[PDB]
Nucleic acid binder design. Structure first.
Ligand SMILES: [Ca+2]
Ligand SMILES: [Ca+2]
Ligand SMILES: [Ca+2]
Ligand SMILES: [Cl-]
Length: 54
DNA sequence: CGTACGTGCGTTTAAGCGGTGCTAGAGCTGTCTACGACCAATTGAGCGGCCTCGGCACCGGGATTGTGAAAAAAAAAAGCTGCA
């Protein structure tokens, strides 16, 4: 148990910050609990809507 | 000034009622654990700060585009007949 480094954005194959998105969900008063996929799905959508506009 | 719509007739239709019978599926229970909160410790991604240098704002000057008058051609249109 000392095996560190990887980011969730990298796991999901994304550019947008999954971790940040997660925190933002958690800190936003949206729901008491937040699934582990919730931010991944969301971030990916924001990536796509961002990419489409650009 | 033309005919698209409102009125009002007689005829036609199926909405609404009040009821009966069948059951999908809404919604409830109780059980049990995978998952998410929280936690602390650990660490590298993203922040501010800084420096650079190439895109783009600004320029002048000439090429090209777009409008309007004026003169002119084409145009419908306007006072005058004849002939019936
Ligand atoms: Ca479960
Ligand atoms: Ca910066
Ligand atoms: Ca540059
Ligand atoms: Cl989830």
């Amino acid at each position: 148990a000392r095996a560190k480094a990887k980011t969730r954005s990298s796991r999901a194959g994304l550019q947008f910050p999954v971790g940040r998105v997660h925190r933002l969900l958690r800190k936003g008063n949206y729901s008491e609990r937040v699934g582990a996929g919730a931010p991944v799905y969301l971030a990916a959508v924001l990536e796509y809507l961002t990419a489409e506009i650009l």
